[PDB]
């Protein structure tokens, strides 16, 4: 909803608005029921990478923060280190425990 | 292209035409169009339609009959 003036927060002209119905191409990045099943099988076959085998050793010793700094150098950016280190904790809670 | 299975079948017929002689050399392959830098965007201005083509356009004096 616009405010009815050229300068402001909303800005500007008021119209009968809604709606565009959603396209098919907006979904794109959404999951499964093949893909999660196939990715589950392609994990037991076979193992983790060498840099990932340091991550779980680093979590047992020096927890977080150091785990991010090692992952940030090996992977691209800080935002990708968030995803990897959060995922590696879910491996320990799932596989090693219970 | 000379083999008759490729000539008759309509899905793979286009490659037999004379315009597709040495695509690899001129850079009409997947890797070729990446190396030339042909993509839609503000990042790709100096090369997009053609690097030398664009230079040849904008380094030229266009004169009409009535100036």
């Amino acid at each position: 909803v616009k405010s009815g003036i050229a300068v402001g927060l909303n800005k500007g002209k008021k119209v009968n608005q809604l709606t565009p119905a959603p396209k098919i191409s907006y979904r794109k990045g959404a999951a499964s029921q093949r893909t999660t099943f196939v990715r589950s099988i392609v994990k037991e076959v076979a193992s983790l990478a060498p840099y990932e085998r340091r991550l779980i050793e680093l979590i047992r010793n020096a927890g977080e923060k150091r785990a991010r700094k090692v992952a940030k150098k090996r992977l691209g950016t800080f935002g990708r280190a968030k995803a990897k280190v959060e995922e590696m904790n879910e491996i320990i809670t799932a596989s090693r425990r219970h | 292209p000379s083999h008759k299975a490729i000539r008759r079948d309509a899905k793979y017929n286009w490659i037999c035409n004379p315009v597709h002689k040495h695509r690899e050399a001129r850079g009409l392959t997947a890797t070729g169009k990446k190396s030339r830098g042909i993509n839609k965007g503000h990042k790709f201005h100096n090369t997009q339609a053609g690097r030398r083509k664009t230079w040849k356009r904008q380094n030229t004096l266009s004169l009409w009959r009535y100036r």
């Binding site: 003036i5 300068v7 927060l9 009968n16 | 380094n59 009959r65």
Partner: protein, 197 residues
């Protein structure tokens, strides 16, 4: 090199410019080629118009939002609203654009009227036998022009209420500058430190 009291010019002629000169002598002759091409195409096609029927569209930016202009294609929502399929519409002389969207009820109606006006006025010949020909109209833009929407009432009441239009702009502009820090000042004092209390 310089010196009287003249303006400092900028002439970019230090490359081999004379090798890459163009003179448009062909202007007059090239016009006849296009008039010949437009005429010869109409002879081949025969009873149909040369142009596809285009929709009405509003322009972008602050500079041009106050004017309407002929777009590219009719969208999929508007073609459905009239009562026809998108695949069928392409062979009747109606342009379709799969990527344009609708977020306005005013433009939505206008183009539905434009399609209903088009479908009524055109005739269609069957595939089989008889074909009662009715000359050719060349330009679709001539028969279906673009008119500017009128948002006007020439004589009108004078309703004042001591608000001041100038004072409204100064207050509204000040809110945009300061809502960032005013949210954060409210997130301290009243929240965080006093939600602890």
């Amino acid at each position: 090199a310089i010196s009287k009291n003249l303006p400092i010019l900028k002439n970019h002629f230090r490359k081999h410019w004379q090798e890459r000169v163009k003179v448009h002598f062909d202007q007059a002759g090239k016009k006849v080629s296009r008039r010949h091409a437009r005429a010869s195409k109409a002879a081949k096609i025969a009873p149909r118009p040369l142009d596809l029927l285009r929709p009405v569209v509003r322009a972008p930016t602050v500079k041009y939002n106050r004017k309407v202009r002929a777009g590219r294609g009719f969208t999929l929502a508007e073609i459905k609203a009239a009562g026809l399929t998108p695949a069928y519409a392409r062979t009747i002389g109606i342009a379709v654009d799969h990527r344009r969207q609708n977020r306005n009820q005013e433009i939505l109606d206008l183009n539905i009227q434009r399609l209903k006006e088009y479908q009524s006025k055109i005739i269609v010949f069957p595939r089989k036998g008889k074909a009662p020909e009715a000359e050719q109209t060349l330009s679709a833009a001539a028969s279906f022009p673009i008119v500017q929407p009128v948002t006007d009432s020439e004589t009108r009441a004078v309703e004042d209420n001591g608000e001041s239009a100038y004072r409204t702009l100064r207050l509204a502009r000040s809110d945009k500058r300061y809502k960032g820090i005013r949210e954060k000042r409210a997130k301290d004092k009243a929240e965080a430190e006093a939600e602890k209390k």
